[PDB]
Symmetry: C5
């Protein structure tokens, strides 16, 4: 079971299209205040307290994506897009949403 | 009726492009207040109350996009994109927007 | 004039790439107050008054997009993206932007 | 210099991929208050004066994008994305971001 | 290594897909106040002081994307997307996110 942002997989052929699947996670305001609010200058994943939160949010979004694909009998999700959207009163909640297309594949050889 | 984030469907060829179609749904601030605002820590679709609502907004949006396609004489919507946009003063309304290209397909066999 | 969110059109060949074209429309705060504010629960574009306004805005944006393409001598716009952006001091203005690539095509037959 | 939102150019072959390039421009609050804040109803870019400002913004973004590509030795930018983000305390600044992949091409004839 | 917003690389064949990779950087409120908040009129990356900041954030994100791909055995990241999201209480923080699909490639010659 592979995940790709590309619409096809070289070396394989998609033998069935099983629909659009989705995963998501929301980081609560508390996580934003604790790890994001204090950021000074430009801070990348490697150094920052926030990256472990984003990563957890991604990891959860992807598992939901994969499990939805699993339930359809798909073995890949292609054409994947990941979006981040700020939600809530204080612009302090974060939604990570993944979407792609569940597919059955066959090796070309 | 097939929906894909990919621009083509292997196994088929598109014989008509019938134009860009859309669907959307808006979750009002009452929904946001009730299911989204109290979120603590990181909450994925599995555990959280909000997920029922997102899902219902998505299905409704796809239904609208599906009806637009079907009305046009199309049998697939390809090159699909789903966007989420918060709107309104309090950032407490959520818009789910879907778009794609309605197409007529013919099987390669 | 054909519009597609796919980068190519099966059955035709792109003979000329004529550049990136765009179209937009902005729905003012008065539209938002009148049609979007205080939407309650989850409302789809099918039953919602707001959709008449969104449909109008997308219509106008595509006209502009179609009109830019025409002036370059194109007969299609491919690889189209549509996004919605909330703008302004009160998050009560919506901008719809379309973009894509103006192209000249030749039917394979 | 050719600009496209599609990944390939029909009629050409990409012989070298030279990396991701970007360009951008920010529209200040003053321009926003002058051209965007007063909009009533639905105004399209064809008649709306704000559109002169957006097109100036995009043009600057594409200038940067193409000059970046020029320096890498490229002759096209493919797989282009255009994005708008509202930024600042009053949702009254607008950033136009463009990205794509700089490439050398070879005409098939 | 090779970064592309295209899903394939003409002249090469993708021999393995190694999963979706991400990188990101956050620009803190202080950078925003010092470089973005004062902008007047329309200011492009070529001339704006904000540009070295965005450039720096992009570089950190791509580095993270880069090493993530390396750790998986990959020699290229294709299907790349860059998104900018304004986050926080005062719309004065900016997240730059990059995602793509890590791959192994083989020269066709």
């Amino acid at each position: 079971m592979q995940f790709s942002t590309t619409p096809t997989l070289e070396g394989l052929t998609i033998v069935e299209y099983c629909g659009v699947v989705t995963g998501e996670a929301i980081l609560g305001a508390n996580i934003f205040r604790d790890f994001f609010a204090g950021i000074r200058d430009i801070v990348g994943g490697r150094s920052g307290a926030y990256e472990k939160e984003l990563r957890k949010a991604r990891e959860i979004a992807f598992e939901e994506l994969g499990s939805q694909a699993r339930a359809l009998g798909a073995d890949a999700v292609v054409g994947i897009d990941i979006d981040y959207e700020t939600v809530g009163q204080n612009g302090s909640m974060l939604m990570v949403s993944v979407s792609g297309t569940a597919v059955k594949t066959r090796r070309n050889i």
